[PDB]
């Protein structure tokens, strides 16, 4: 699809058997999801930007379905104000910026 | 152009006759740049990021060139980690997400 930017580019995602709304964010290096359980090992990480830093749990090799496109990658889980799909997963679905 | 997301989508912008590097961010509602001098009056604005909210200075009808495309709009100035081009200006330059 072609997504215009008049409003926030929110899409439905499927992760860990759950349906969630997430923002497609080209400014994000990583994907960050609100508190939820994920299977496997994890390691602590700090991520930051506007307003400072938050502590998150880093889970690797997690499958996410974004607009019917399956992608696998690292997913950070923590107290984010919005679920963010970052570049690590946007590349996998072949998402590009065009103008 | 078509910009892939394997690397950060950093572009050259020109504001107040100076060249600066900025990130094209579909996850940002507004454009925020690091401390600099801008003309006219400013209004108060709060923007929320991953770590919480910060106060910024809102300047309207600012001339800015983004990757060679002319835009005229709202520019926020504050303690941002990197210069960010948000949806208010990405819409002006005709930017869309595609997959
Ligand atoms: C990764 C980059 C950099 N920042 S960041 O916090 O530094 C950061 C996020 C992760 C990892 C590193 C850095 C974000 C934009 C922040 C931003 C600007 F820069 C300039 C102007 C406005 C804003 N804020 C918004 O537009 C609000 C928005 C939002 C999006 C991501 C957030 F995390 C927090 C809040 C929102 C969306 C839906 C909702 F329901 C509630 C809020 C996202 N893109
Ligand atoms: Cl990854
Ligand atoms: Cl590619
Ligand atoms: Cl504007």
Swiss-Prot record, chains A, B:
It comes from Human immunodeficiency virus type 1 group M subtype B (isolate BH5). The active site is at residue 25. Residues 20-89 form the Peptidase A2 domain. Aspartyl protease that mediates proteolytic cleavages of Gag and Gag-Pol polyproteins during or shortly after the release of the virion from the plasma membrane. Cleavages take place as an ordered, step-wise cascade to yield mature proteins. This process is called maturation. Displays maximal activity during the budding process just prior to particle release from the cell. Also cleaves Nef and Vif, probably concomitantly with viral structural proteins on maturation of virus particles. Hydrolyzes host EIF4GI and PABP1 in order to shut off the capped cellular mRNA translation. The gene is gag-pol. Residues 1-5, 49-55, 88-99 are annotated as: Dimerization of protease. It comes from the Viruses. This is Protease. Homodimer, whose active site consists of two apposed aspartic acid residues.
């Amino acid at each position: 699809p072609q997504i215009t930017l008049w409003k926030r580019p929110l899409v439905t995602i499927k992760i860990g058997g759950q349906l969630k709304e997430a923002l497609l964010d080209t400014g994000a290096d990583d994907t960050v999801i609100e508190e939820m359980s994920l299977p496997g090992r994890w390691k602590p990480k700090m991520i930051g930007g506007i307003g400072g830093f938050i502590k998150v749990r880093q889970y690797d090799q997690i499958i996410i379905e974004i607009c019917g496109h399956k992608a696998i990658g690292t997913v950070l889980v923590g107290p984010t104000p919005v679920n963010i799909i970052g570049r690590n997963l946007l590349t996998q679905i072949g998402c590009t910026l065009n103008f």
